[PDB]
Structure formats: C-alpha cells, structure tokens
Structure 1
C-alpha cells in the first residue's frame, strides 16, 4: 500500500531496546510556583539588596531572575543606558545559608556566562528605547520613559532543571545582590545633570525564582563549580590564583582601565552595536567639522587648527595623504574648506603624527540652501574600531606636543561619558587581540602554552558562542550526573596554584591607544561538594 514493496519485503533471537515505546516513570510528587520577593535595600555607600527565602513549603529553587524598575528620566541633555543594562547593574551576587556562602559570582562573570543567551540578554535591556542616546530639550522634557528589565541570574542549579535545583529544606537562603554605581550603566553628556540624577536614582529590585513544593523529598549530595576572579596589577602581564586544588576550567582575558581619563568619548552608536555602527557614528561626528562650507575662512575653531580651502582640483594634500573633497550646490559667495588636523597626536615636535584627517580619502556631498548645512553622500575612509574607542583625554594629554583636539566647541559639547563596567580588550567591540602569547603554570611546571588564541577558538566552538575567552577546560564529563573532572593538586610538590603569564603585543607610542591602560583577568572554577546534613553547606574539594 502506502509503504514501498522493497521495504515490506526487507522486514517481513537478539535482545533489542524498545525505541518505539517507554514505561512512563512516576516522578517525585511536587508542585512548582513562580515566587517574586521584594528585598531590603542597604548602602563606599554601595547599594545592596537582600532577599530572604524561608518557607516550609519551598523545598527547592532554581532560575533566579532579578527585575529592575528603571525610573522616568526627565531634564536636559543627552542620556542613554548601556546595552544589556540589567547585567551591567550587577557588581556581585551571592546565594548563602546559615552555614555560609553556597555559591557566588562577580557581575562581569554572570554576564560572560549569559553572553551566548540572546533571550536573557534582550530581557536585561537591549532596545532603541533604552540604548539609543535620547536628548532632553526643556527641564521637564522626558528623555527616557520608565521601563522594567529582567536579569537572569544563571546558577549551576539550572543545568539539569529539577535535578540540579538548590534544595533548602529547614534552611534559610539569603540572596545578596551588590549593585554597581548608576554611572556605570549610563551614557550621558556634560549638559545632562548627572549630579542630581545620581542623588535621585535608587535601584528597585525584585527577586523571582521557580520554587518547588516537594512531598517526601529524597535529598542526595551534589557537586558545584564556584567561579573565582583575580585581576592583575595595572598593565602587568602576570596574575596568580592561589590554593588551586580541584579546578574544572581556567579563563584568561584583558580589560581596559580608564582611570587616567575622564571616561569621555567623541561618539557612541546607541542601540546599533555592530563594528560598522561604531565607525559610522564616529565618522558622522567628525564630518560636522571635517568639511566646512563658509563665506571666507571658517570661524569658531582653535588657533591651532589648520583649515585649508579645497582647490579647483578637489584634492587637498595633508603630507603624503590626499583627500578628495567635492560638494555640490555650493553658493557663489562660499568656498569648500577641509580641517587638515581635526584630531592629532605626537610625542615629538617634528616626528610621526597620528592625524585623523589623514584617515580620510574622499568626501562627497551636497549643500542644502534651506537648512544651510552640508548633506554628505559618500565617505571613503580608513577609520577603525580603535579610533572610536580612544578617550578624548588622550588627544589632549601631556604626552602630546600638539593641541590635540581641534574640533569646534559645538562638537566637543556632544562628547559622551562611557563607564561600561564589562568592556574587554582595548576597543568597544573587543576586536583587537593584544595577547601575543599565553603561558599557564600549575605550580612551577608549564600546564599549557599558546601563541595563537586556539583556547579561545575551542571555547567559542564548545560553548557555541561568538564572544568567547582563552579558556582551558578540564571537565568534559557530563554535568550533574557525574563528579566533574578536575586538575589534581600536589601541595607537597608546591603544585597548588595557577600562574598566568601573557606577552602583550606593543603598540606605536605616537598612536593615542598606547596610553589606554590594560588589566589581566584570570577566572578559576573551583570544585565544591554540596552537603545537606543539618542545613545546606559547601566543602572545597582538596
């Protein structure tokens, strides 16, 4: 009939496993409930939220979600939230019992664990409404409407759902959330009254979790991976994690330190977070001053600026670099001018110069008589992600022989303070790999060494993530159903620590990014045993 004759003839003693039917096992009798709790706020006057979970009927819990009520932002100036605002709010999270800390994570590490989860990232705050830079005109004008963001606190209790869930029978569980200053989660200009905003802003958190009421629970001991972070000394290529006895993994990455700067940047693309989006935003900001259509030489620029009239030929020569500038519908009384030194950096008076005007090759557009502006059609340039990641301070630094920032006062007023706590590398997109070589030593012996980021490639492949780190995985054994595979220590032979040594690729000293400080971050996942005898407790595997 419907089945082909060749198949029916091929089919129509050996022990065979049933693949078409299964005995439906009766599970443990339980009832789940989505429980939300309001916390206790406390105040370096850091904001701390405490959530106490104690209920006879709450037998187990998993899937922690922290909601945050972002207030209405009213006033004058430019304002916007950092992408994934909710995760950036978190400085530290700790789940503890009467016997102490059961599990804890640093804000950045929780974000790193959720970077592959698109849904969790969108929930935490990723919209044009939240992340684009909105402007307030009147002192009562609404810049940002109030919104609620949801931060998924990924814990090891979620790995195998009910099986991995944190059991809390006859024990009090306290979820403590430490918040980063509101400065970190906000991108604003000088016009914005941050002083008042910081005073008026208050974190409004509410912890939600999936609670389980289990009838006659059969609690058995489990294993947990607890992350440990070590941040090296400023620009130092070495960091050491002490007392390493049973580690499942070791992650190594770099972070920029903007202490020597005012955290002000020329441009920000807002919601659009692609590398091209960052570059286009920068080009757009520079173009206002780069090509000027004026009646006689342009005014409102520093004496230091070298604004040159574009010849009939269209080509302007800034040293070896040629810039083709051709604007249409230019009035008979006006000429086309090019700012030949918009941003320039040099450590010596007659040496190499890093000039941003030289990074442009062709600028075409049409002058609008109605709006008295220049509408740019096509731009041919060599601007990179690093250029957009240079803090304004480094252009006007003492290392610079030249003035540095030759932009108009109008353009300089549009600069934005960016204090994102989770920036990696030396650029906003973490594009540039500054680690030339990695060395990992377990005790005094070399555990691993690499010249290329092959550990990052394996991390990206194995975790199915596009934003991985140089990670050394020691556990390839299935989680929850097995005791994780760990590096075994030998205290007697001094093999009880992990020492990381990197070799940073050095930059040109005449390039402003050379002066961006670096920090080596080393993350270690230590193995602990969860014991439930007389309350919940953890014990370090040694």
Structure 2
C-alpha cells in the first residue's frame, strides 16, 4: 500500500536534564583610559552554571535637578553603550561596537521600549529654580543580543569549566543628553555615574555533551571625513556586508533650533521646528518690531495679505488684531548664500500661508492653519552652518529669546544627513572583492532585500552570503583567494549632488562598512575561537 508519516502523534523525546535560572550581577566599575571612560566588568564563574545566554544590562538613571532644558535621547540605554566584549582565559569569544548592537536590535520594539523610550525620559523637561526636579530617577534595560540567543539552549554559550568575563565600555554622558545653554551640564557630567547590573539566563545542566559551534563576529570600518570609499582588509569568510553613512558634526557646536522629544515621527520633527520659527516669523506689534538684528528684514503685511519674497508669495491673515497694532512678516529669518546677488536659501520663502487669531487676554497669536514646504533636512541643519564663514549674509536673524532655546544634540547613532535617515544620499554603490566587482546598484535594492528578508522597517544596504539555517548548519560564506589578491572588500559610493547655497551641503559625511566574519567556537580545554581561513 503506502508508508505514511504520522502528522497526528509524536514520540515525545526526553531532553537533557537541566534547570534554568535568572542571574543578576553587580560589576567592577573603572574610569581608566581616554577622558577617563567608564568600563564595567562582570565575572561569571560557578561550578553549577554550565551554559548561558540572553544578556540584559540594567542602568540606574539619577534624579536630574536645577535650571534649564534637559531630556534623554530615545533608547537612552543602547546609546550609552560604546563597546561590549565577551571573553575567557583564552581571550575574546565575541565583541560588538555599541552602534552595531543597536542596529541588530532596531527591529525589536520590546528591547527598544525597555532601553528607555517614554514621555518621562525623552521629552525635553524644564527646571525653573536651582532646586527644581527636571527628571525623576529611573531604570532602563538593555538587551545585549548575542549569537547565543538564536536557538535558545542549542545555541547557548557553554562554560567548559571556564571563567567568562563580560566587559561594557560606556559613552560619555554628553552623548545621551539633549540640553540647552541654561542647563549646568558641567556639574551634571562631574556628578553623573553609570550604575550597571548584568543579568543572564543560566543553565545548570547534568551531563552536557559539548560539540563545536560557529559564530559571526561583526567588524566595522569608518572612512575618512567626506571620502566616498572604505575598505575591509583580511576578509577570508564573511556571512554578510552592510553599508551606511553617518554625519560628522565636528565642524559645529552641535546646536539645533528644535527637537520633538518622545514624538519621533518625521511629521513630529517638522511640526516642532515650524512651531519654533512661528514665534519670530509673524509679529503683531504697534510700530516696527524691536529686538531683531539690523540685518533682519521685517515687512508690514499689506491689505491683500500677500508679502512677496522675490518669487515666493506668503499669505498672512491674523484675526482680532488691535487697531493700534499691525501684522509683520520676517522675510529672512534664516538665510544662506555663498555669493552676493545670487541664489539664496531663505526659510521664510518655505511658507505659503499663515493664518490665526490674536489673543487680547494672553497678548499672543494662536496659529490655526499653516501651509509650508519645510522638510526633515531643515530641522537637521546645525545652527553653526547657518552662521558659517562661507555665508555672505548674517544668516541667523532670529531673536535672542529664540537663540537661547537652541538644543545640544550629540546622539551617537545618527545615520545619513537628517535625524530620521529619510534622505538617501547614495546615488550608486559598488562592492569589490579584490579588483573584481562583486556587486553594484543605482537604487537601494540591497536595503529592500534586507528589510524583506529580516522583516524590519529600518534596514541598510546589506549583501547576504548566507541563506542556510543557523546553528544546525555550518554557515555559507564569501571565501577569499589570497594568491589572486581577493582578501579584501572595497566599497565605493557616489553621493547625490547638493546645492552649494543650501547649509546641508556642509554637513560632513562618513561611510560605514560592517563585515560579519565567521569564527569556530571550540570548547576544547576552555572556550576558544578561531577565525575561519
């Protein structure tokens, strides 16, 4: 007849006898090295812990007191990690850069929430007195995703009667805090201390039968400022290659006009910016408005309500304006040009219509409808670039009140040339293995594949060389040919052409190339790793 596979019953296999346990450890804190950077060390050695995985680092955030504006960057927990390294008596087993750990967890909304993504943390709070509480104390949790979590117990790190050391290097606190001038960052930085604790799932296993494993170790290279090339040397067995860009704000004071806070949509960034500009853009004054630079060009709105700024027509109509007063428009709030009587980037020209009602009670304008063409790039321009030496105009024609509200943003994990990484600034990408073109593209097809294959909406241009199921199989890799000089991956990009009279032209770019090398994990006489060659 016919031999059939039973799809209604199963012979329940008896597994290895084990007992899991959640373990938490306090570490050893050290302020040694460059600018006395914080390093936490956690030593795991126990006769009963046979294997482990699922590392979670918790951080105690202090009470923030005083005057000024202060808020934490979104996912504050991931952003204060600089480097993570797992090692034994035989040396490093696995290690990752903070930004690469963050990139691996970006598709895990739970891990991101736990690390600190809330109104309480991420909104920009204000202290009114020196004894006022800006932020209340809080605990954040950072999931340190490792290759040991992939297939739970099967993929766990076995401790071959060895001592495992987890070392966490922290970023300066300046990187995770959004603040204004008024805030006393100097004494905050002096008083701040990283208070960490490491948790992991430990397994007490009876009669383990250890076998060798394979692990992928991410390695990254950052190019020279504004160079559209980068190279990864000694590439012998890679499972994937990822490419992205980062802005470099070293030529600026890292001050930006606005920040949306906990609301992180592209619309939220734009709305926060427009709201800051509208304070100085439309003025209801008796005579001509006062307290603006001499270079400012504030014009009385005509009876038809249209103000012409060259080619741009701005329609301004404000209701209930008192008889003794008039409506004025700032026609050059933020200006940029590299040549006199030539092209100009004027933010006031990005407004089509402004409508509202004047409040006799609060003596201010309440804006109803605003038609504009402000984008995520405009909100991402550092205030330094508006007032650069290249600019023939004064640039920043805002009030001193507005300039005082500007924020310092030093988020370490920004990509592209805008806060949302919306703008694609790569026109073409070429990857070479030796001198042979391995891959090229004129569109982000590699990012599209990344997002589809990993079911993430925050992908990067990625080349995958391994489609083989993890843990149960030895991974598939791009393999070197040293004799033919094929022992390196060279990435070359063509950046999209930008307007010289737009301030973003002057945001410095850095090309980031991430390579995942294959390693063999051997548990013969303690845990050891070997680079596949």
Which range, TM-score by smaller chain? over 0.9
Deviation at 1:444, TM superposition (A): 1.1
Is this contact kept in 2: 1:56–1:169, CA < 8 A?
A: no
Contact 2:160/2:525 (CA < 8 Å) preserved in 1? no
Cα separation, 1, equivalents of 2:348 and 2:265:
23
Moved over 6 A (4+): none
Mapped partners of 2:197, 2:234: distance in 1: 36
Aligned to 2:512: 521
Q: C-alpha offsets along residues 293-323 of structure 1, whole Å, 9 cap, x if unaligned?
A: 0110000111110000001110000111000
Offset at residue 24 of structure 1 (A): 1.0
Shift of 1:169: 2.8
Q: Is the contact made by 2:337 and 2:392 (CA closer than 8 Å) also made in structure 1? A: yes
Q: Deviation of residue 343 (structure 1)?
A: 0.2
SS in structure 2 of the partner of residue 394 of structure 1: helix
Partner of 2:16: 28
* 1:18, distance to aligned residue in structure 2 (A): 1.0
Query: Are residues 1:211 and 2:199 paired?
Result: no
What's 2:453 paired with? 462
User: Offset at 1:516?
Assistant: 0.1
Instruction: Give the drift of 1:324.
Output: 0.4
* Rounded Cα–Cα distance in structure 2 between residues aligned with 1:506 and 1:236: 14
Q: Deviations over 1:163-216 (max 9, x none)?
A: 000011310100000001101100000000000000011100000000000011
Residues 254 and 410 of structure 2 are in contact (CA less than 8 Å); yes or no, is this contact kept in structure 1?
yes
Deviation of 1:106 (Å): 0.5
CA distance in 2 between counterparts of 1:507 and 1:180 reads: 33
Does the 8 A contact of 1:58 with 1:169 survive in 2? no
* Alpha-carbon distance between aligned partners in 1 of 2:481 and 2:343, rounded to the nearest angstrom: 53
Aligned to 2:97: 106
Q: Distance in 2 between matches of 1:296 and 1:276?
A: 35
Q: What is the rounded CA distance, in whole Å, between the counterparts of 1:251 and 1:454 in structure 2?
A: 13
Tell me the distance in 2 between the aligned counterparts of 1:506 and 1:260. Answer: 21
Q: Which runs of 5+ in 1 are unaligned?
A: 1-12
Deviations 1:122-175 (A, max 9, x none): 000000000000000010111000100000000000000000000113101000
Q: Answer whether contact 2:90 2:527 (CA < 8 A) is retained.
A: yes
1:488 offset after TM fit, Å?
Answer: 1.0
Deviations 1:489-538 (A, max 9, x none): 11111110100001111200000000000000000000000000010000
CA deviations 1:33-64 (Å, max 9, x no partner) are 00000011111211100000011101000000
Give the paired residue count: 530
- The answer to whether the 8 Å contact 1:265/1:416 transfers is yes
Q: Secondary structure at the match of 1:183?
A: helix
Contact 2:239–2:465 (8 Å) recurs in 1: yes
- SS for the counterpart of 2:190 is helix
Residue 142 of structure 1: aligned partner: 133
Partner of 1:433: 424
Q: CA deviation at 1:450?
A: 0.7
Pairwise CA RMSD = 0.5
After superposition, give the CA deviation of every residue in 1:459-495 in whole Å (9 maximum; x if it has no partner): 0100111110000000000000000000011111111
2:56 counterpart of 1:65: yes
- Distance in 2 between the 1:404 and 1:15 partners? 82
**CA distances 1:423-481 after superposition (whole Å, capped 9, x unpaired):** 00000000110110000000111111111110000001001111100000000000000
Q: What do the CA deviations read for 1:226-272 (whole angstroms, capped 9, x no partner)?
A: 00000000010110000000000000000000000000000000000
Q: Distance in 1 between matches of 2:174 and 2:213?
A: 40
Q: Scaled by the length of structure 1, what TM-score is found?
A: 0.97
Structure 2 counterparts to residues 317-332 of structure 1, below 5 A: 317-332=308-323
